[PDB]
């Protein structure tokens, strides 16, 4: 049985995979991590005890029958009541996370991907360094809490500019309503005069590389799905003084494909969402690999890639 | 240069390791994780440019000169002012953590221990499973949010009882700012009638094994320092079978340091409890049995292997 580690509000990727798994003659159990412990019962035995078992209403999954694990979405304990004490709620979340992580890490069979591999590939500074050691171009990157280094960094890349971004995912719910998020943003001359807040939280700054194309590369095992989109606000080839777009298939150079495969092999991954950009002079710059990045918007929308089939195959075929 | 990843309020283990490193003709930089970003400056470069530098007052460290890393204490940014907005503070703590973790993971040289190894050995359920696969006795354990499975677990071990414990480390601060902590605690029959709170947080229950001694085992490389106390620590000689099994457990997780807890029954049965990759050791060095552990850590940090 394929154990699918997700949450209740996950998107259409889950039913796409379970049906492709079910259509191959195998079965799959959906484990919504956010509905634990409030609704889902998990029993984890260590020793010569009874078998570990996950119970979700009528559904029941014995952990000895797990042949594969899809390490998809991890939202441990989100459905804990809001009216709970904040000290007990934060402590309960950390206990739930350690519990379910220990369950997954103890299960045998095929993992997509193992926790130790996803954890090790989540260091974005290590991603760029390993990609560069493999011969891939990476943008100039500085994570810093030091204004003098940041000023020096923005100055040497003044012609094209620099952006900033956070290494973490989070949101600030301010005032009375909305959620606020730090997207990758250009830093301005005015932002450079207000660098005093770096002593309370560092940021990651990157060389802003002008790009002709954005590449979205999804790898399943050794199968490479490459999609490109023209993001040029001013496209030179089409420019006309007298006078939409969508994602389309793209053929990577076999050298880039073999380098991305070595990147997957180094971290031990069999799934990965890789971001690259292509300059007008056809230089390929590696940006980021997300071991749990999305893929559904490349399958349900152009170029309608059949990734969910490839994932279900490697899950039920192991290797 | 040995990078030492600790924090400002960490105990007297750091200076002794430092002096032992310095007395061996090498250099050592102390990096207090809690004093970043408010005081310590870190600059992590990726790309064709540099690697990075850590600046702390007059002291600076070029990450190119890092020959080894002691992954000791990780209190990322706990010296943030408490007058800060709580939403911004927790977001800053999460950003500071990912920044320094990526710094450590990217560094080459000898790590004691690597992050990926420590994160993998942190699964206590995996510790008991691998210890059992190597031939070590482990107490019957149940992690659960299910009262029915817990009641059966307590009836199963009704003769000796069961204890409960939390997998996580935390502390609840009451109204008087007093510090509350969940130690390993017995489970009474009154507790078994109030299991409804398991739907809000699971717990880890274990067979209460009656014991004669409690063993504190500290391993540096392949050197084993065993202490025993009656439940004033004393030396203790493990059977070689137990020592080799613990060495195989460390080699599986890829650790060269570990704090291992065991108990011995009156009939001399050795039960494996836990391995903490960053567990303390100083109290076994400054107090009986005065194990020279800080010397063994400094020697493995300088001599690589």
């Amino acid at each position: 049985t394929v154990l699918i580690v997700t949450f209740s509000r996950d998107n259409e990727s889950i039913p796409l995979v379970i049906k492709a798994i079910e259509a191959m003659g195998k079965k799959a159990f959906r484990f919504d991590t956010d509905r634990f412990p409030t609704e889902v019962k998990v029993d984890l035995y260590s020793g010569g005890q009874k078998g570990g078992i996950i119970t979700d209403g009528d559904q029941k999954l014995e952990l000895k029958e797990v042949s594969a694990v899809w390490y998809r979405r991890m939202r441990y304990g989100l459905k804990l009541p809001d009216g709970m004490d904040s000290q007990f709620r934060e402590a309960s979340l950390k206990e739930c996370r350690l519990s379910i992580r220990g369950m997954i890490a103890s299960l045998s069979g095929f993992h997509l991907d193992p926790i130790a591999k996803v954890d090790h590939a989540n260091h974005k500074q290590l991603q760029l360094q390993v990609a560069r050691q493999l011969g891939l171009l990476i943008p100039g990157t500085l994570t810093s809490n030091n204004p003098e280094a940041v000023k020096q960094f923005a100055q040497e890349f003044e012609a094209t500019g620099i952006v900033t971004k956070m290494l973490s995912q989070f949101a600030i719910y301010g005032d009375k309503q909305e959620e606020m998020v730090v997207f990758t943003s250009p830093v301005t001359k005015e932002d450079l005069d207000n660098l005093e807040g770096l002593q309370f939280c560092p940021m990651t700054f990157q060389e802003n590389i002008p790009k002709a194309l954005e590449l979205r590369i999804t790898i399943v095992g050794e199968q490479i799905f490459t999609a490109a989109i023209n993001s040029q606000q001013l496209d030179g080839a089409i420019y006309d003084w007298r006078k939409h777009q969508q994602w389309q298939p793209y053929d990577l150079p076999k050298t880039i494909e073999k380098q991305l495969l070595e990147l997957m092999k180094y971290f031990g991954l069999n799934y990965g969402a890789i971001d690259m950009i292509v300059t007008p002079d056809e230089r390929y710059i590696f940006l980021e690999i997300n071991p749990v990045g999305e893929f559904f918007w490349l399958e349900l929308y152009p170029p309608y890639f059949p990734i969910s089939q490839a994932i279900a195959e490697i899950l039920v075929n192991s290797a | 240069t040995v990078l030492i990843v600790t924090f400002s309020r960490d105990n007297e283990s750091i200076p002794l390791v430092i002096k032992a490193i310095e007395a061996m003709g090498k250099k050592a930089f102390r990096f207090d994780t809690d004093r970043f970003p408010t005081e310590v400056k870190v600059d992590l470069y990726s790309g064709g440019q540099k690697g990075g530098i850590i600046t702390d007052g007059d002291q600076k460290l070029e990450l190119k000169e890092v020959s080894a890393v002691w992954y000791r204490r990780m209190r990322y940014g706990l010296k943030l002012p408490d007058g800060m907005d709580s939403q911004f503070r927790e977001a800053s703590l999460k950003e500071c953590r990912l920044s320094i973790r990526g710094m450590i993971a990217s560094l080459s040289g000898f790590h004691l221990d690597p992050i990926a190894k420590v994160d993998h050995a942190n699964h206590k359920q995996l510790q008991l499973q691998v210890a059992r696969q190597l031939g070590l006795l482990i107490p019957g354990t149940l992690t659960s949010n299910n009262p029915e499975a817990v009641k059966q677990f307590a009836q199963e071990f009704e003769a000796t009882g069961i204890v409960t414990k939390m997998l996580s480390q935390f502390a609840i601060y009451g109204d008087k700012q007093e510090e509350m902590v969940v130690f390993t605690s017995p489970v009474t029959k009154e507790d078994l009638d109030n299991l409804e709170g398991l739907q809000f947080c699971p717990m880890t229950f274990q067979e209460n094994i009656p014991k004669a001694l409690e063993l504190r085992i500290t391993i540096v490389g392949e050197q084993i320092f065993t202490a025993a106390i009656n439940s004033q620590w004393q030396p203790y000689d493990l059977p070689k079978t137990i020592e080799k099994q613990l060495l195989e457990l460390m080699k599986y997780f890829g650790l060269n340091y570990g704090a291992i807890d065991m108990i011995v029954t009156p009939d001399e049965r050795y039960i494996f409890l836990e391995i903490n990759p960053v567990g303390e050791f100083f109290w076994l060095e400054l107090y009986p049995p005065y194990f020279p552990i800080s010397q063994a850590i400094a020697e493995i940090l300088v001599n690589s292997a």
Binding site: P81, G83, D85 | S185, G197, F200, C201, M203
Partner: peptide, 12 residues
């Protein structure tokens, strides 16, 4: 709305 581990909180 209390979790089960609240019953075992001691004083450090």
């Amino acid at each position: 709305a209390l979790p089960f581990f609240a019953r075992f909180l001691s004083v450090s």
